[PDB]
Ligand binder design. Structure first.
Ligand SMILES: O=C(CO)N1CCc2c(c(-c3ccc(Cl)c(C#Cc4ccc(Cl)cc4)c3)nn2CCCN2CCOCC2)C1
Length: 221
């Protein structure tokens, strides 16, 4: 045991406000910028919301992504590398639909040097990345009423699978009343769960596929 028993990156002012994706399946775009927003804060001291809409409109078919019909955080990061930047959310706000690409380099608020993917199903490796690097973009299996209806406590769904279909951000981990959890930031607004967060069962056999496809970006000096 060489890691903290608990982490929460919100407490270092590294997490932006919970967003609301609505009826556009842009959880992957929110997951991606969430993670890159923390690296930018660590780097620059400034906490700035980055443009998930930029990803939806611009990180498209060349990156295997389909906008509001889904995509991946790893290739969202590759776009941001290839494009040599991403706009701030305030210059390029979220509309919850597919649009023409309107990136403007004058409004670039972050960059990406590289990203790292973690091995599938490894909750000890995920825990290390979150303690030592920052918030980690993950997929979860969110296709269950109990997920949609989640209010509080440590989520555990018996019929949850490791096949992921929903992009979220791991911003911490800990133990609440006997139950180890990952602290997860969703993009369903503030009225979902614990002011927009869900604590999901940890060290429970890759529960809901939380450790199936982690990745995190880096901004180097
Ligand atoms: O789960 C498995 C196998 O166990 N999956 C099959 C294999 C897989 C899944 C996810 C993955 C990771 C994270 C997220 Cl977030 C998602 C998603 C999503 C999503 C879908 C629809 C909408 Cl509307 C929104 C989000 C998928 N990543 N991968 C790895 C494949 C990555 N690649 C290879 C390179 O080009 C892009 C696709 C899913």
């Amino acid at each position: 045991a060489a890691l903290p028993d608990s982490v929460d990156w919100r407490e270092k002012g590294c997490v932006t406000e919970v967003k609301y994706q609505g009826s556009c399946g842009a959880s992957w775009a929110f997951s991606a910028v969430g993670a890159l927003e923390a690296q930018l804060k660590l780097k620059t001291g400034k906490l700035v919301s980055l443009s998930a809409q930029n990803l939806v409109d611009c990180s498209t078919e060349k990156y295997g992504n389909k906008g509001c019909n889904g995509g991946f955080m790893t290739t969202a990061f590759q776009y941001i590398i290839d494009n040599k930047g991403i706009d701030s959310d305030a210059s390029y706000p979220y509309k919850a639909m597919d649009q023409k690409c309107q990136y403007d380099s004058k409004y670039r608020a972050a960059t990406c040097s590289k990203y790292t993917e973690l091995p599938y199903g490894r909750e000890d490796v995920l825990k290390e990345a979150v303690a030592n690097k920052g918030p980690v973009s993950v997929g979860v299996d969110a296709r269950h009423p109990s997920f949609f209806l989640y209010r509080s406590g440590v989520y555990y769904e018996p019929s949850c699978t490791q096949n992921v279909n929903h992009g979220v951000l791991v911003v911490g981990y800990g133990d609440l009343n006997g139950k180890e959890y990952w602290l997860v930031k969703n993009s369903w607004g503030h009225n979902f769960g614990e002011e927009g967060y869900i604590r999901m069962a940890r060290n429970k056999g890759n529960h809901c596929g939380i450790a199936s496809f982690p990745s995190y970006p880096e901004i180097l000096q």
